[PDB]
């Protein structure tokens, strides 16, 4: 059946997702809820606890935190790249188009996965070794005080949909295979792959969330929402790189942010 094939694709993506991302939502929610068996994460809720944690997990704290997020982003880009390479048909696409899909899609994926590590009170850091409170993050001096708040707002709404890792693997794959990214040289093959992924996502949601009315439509809207989140983030970065000095940007991020 065409449906049977869609389930095999869904499973292939889930398995690849597990191989590519060390900290899954399943593992993360276990930590956030306490069910975890491992050692509890070190909580950073103020300047003093951040100092203590710099030992457990020159520049002012706000910059150190900001750049810490950037370094985590670099790590995430590499993980996402490995995942993209597992999506059937991806490595056979024009190499320049693969670069384009990642360049314009990684941040949307980063924010999708970050939600898996967040709750209304804070976010897991360094793969669950720490938990930084939302309260502390917005206490940072401007413009850093509102750096993550929009991501927390998105995550609370996104997490209310109760997706699991199996749903997420397909959701992320659909986003990466967006045929409308600027500068793509061969759109058709990307669209054909995405159309198949979309069919797999729809079936996945109907089977995994039988009572969740219009979940597919809602996810399509979250995809649009994520692009708006990235737009704002990019806008804030330019405000920072306009008022802050001596700050260094990781070359991988410099490449992604260029002409973006």
């Amino acid at each position: 059946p065409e449906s049977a094939d869609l389930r095999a694709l869904a499973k292939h993506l889930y398995d690849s997702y597990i191989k590519s991302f060390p900290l899954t939502k399943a593992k993360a929610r276990a930590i956030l809820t306490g069910k975890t068996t491992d050692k509890s994460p070190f909580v950073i809720y103020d300047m003093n606890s951040l100092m203590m944690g710099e030992d457990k997990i020159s520049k002012e704290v706000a910059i150190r935190i900001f750049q810490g997020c950037q370094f985590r982003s670099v790590e995430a880009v590499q993980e996402i790249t490995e995942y993209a390479k597992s999506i059937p048909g991806f490595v056979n696409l024009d190499l320049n188009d693969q670069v384009t899909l990642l360049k314009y899609g990684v941040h949307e994926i980063i924010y999708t996965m970050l939600a898996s590590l967040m709750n209304k009170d804070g976010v897991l850091i360094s793969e669950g070794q720490g938990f930084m409170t939302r309260e502390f993050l917005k206490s940072l001096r401007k413009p850093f005080g509102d750096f993550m708040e929009p991501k927390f707002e998105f995550a609370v709404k996104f997490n209310a949909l109760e997706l699991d890792d199996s749903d997420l693997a397909i959701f992320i794959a659909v986003i990466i295979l967006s045929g409308d990214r600027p500068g793509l040289l061969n759109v058709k093959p990307i669209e054909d792959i995405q159309d198949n992924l979309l069919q797999a996502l729809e079936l996945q949601l109907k089977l995994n969330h039988p009572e969740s009315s219009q979940l597919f439509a809602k996810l399509l809207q979250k995809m649009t929402d994520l692009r708006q989140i990235v737009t704002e983030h990019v806008q804030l970065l330019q405000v920072i790189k306009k008022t802050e000095t001596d700050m260094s940007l990781h070359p991988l991020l410099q490449e992604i942010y260029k002409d973006l």
Binding site: L95, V99, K103, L252, E255, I256
Partner: peptide, 10 residues
């Protein structure tokens, strides 16, 4: 580019 290099590493 760096993204290209990451994409090429098997």
């Amino acid at each position: 580019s760096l993204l290209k290099k990451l994409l090429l590493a098997p």
